[PDB]
Swiss-Prot record:
<feature type="repeat" description="ANK 1">
    <location>
        <begin position="2"/>
        <end position="44"/>
    </location>
</feature>
<comment type="subunit">
    <text>Homotetramer. Interacts with a cAMP-dependent protein kinase type II regulatory subunit (PRKAR2A or PRKAR2B) and ACBD3. Interacts with SLC50A1; the interaction probably occurs intracellularly and depends on TRPV2 N-glycosylation.</text>
</comment>
<feature type="repeat" description="ANK 2">
    <location>
        <begin position="45"/>
        <end position="91"/>
    </location>
</feature>
<feature type="repeat" description="ANK 3">
    <location>
        <begin position="92"/>
        <end position="123"/>
    </location>
</feature>
<protein>
    <recommendedName>
        <fullName>Transient receptor potential cation channel subfamily V member 2</fullName>
    </recommendedName>
</protein>
<comment type="function">
    <text>Calcium-permeable, non-selective cation channel with an outward rectification. Seems to be regulated, at least in part, by IGF1, PDGF and neuropeptide head activator. May transduce physical stimuli in mast cells. Activated by temperatures higher than 52 degrees Celsius; is not activated by vanilloids and acidic pH.</text>
</comment>
<feature type="modified residue" description="Phosphoserine">
    <location>
        <position position="11"/>
    </location>
</feature>
<comment type="similarity">
    <text>Belongs to the transient receptor (TC 1.A.4) family. TrpV subfamily. TRPV2 sub-subfamily.</text>
</comment>
Amino acid sequence: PNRFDRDRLFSVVSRGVPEELTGLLEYLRRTSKYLTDSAYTEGSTGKTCLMKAVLNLQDGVNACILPLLQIDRDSGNPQPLVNAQCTDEFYRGHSALHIAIEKRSLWCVKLLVENGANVHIRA
């Protein structure tokens, strides 16, 4: 339960269950890695856990977006995975705020903007 792979956490955030997220902080603080490192996102595209959470909302509401936010703001390296975007040539610059705006959900746009969001991110 302590160690969580990329696919495991992607599946957890796909269902939007915060209760299955009380295993991440220990994992980050044990191996002294960062949630913003190259051990949590897909290499090809760059889709992070926060983005994959934003790609699916059951009723325009996700209770799992917040827990990632407070568990990433206590140990994040200067990028809070809010200003981090894809690296592929197709989507070079596409950040989570772009998904938030595109899905037509003002709520998550807020959650992104109070917790810090460079609005001047070019896709």
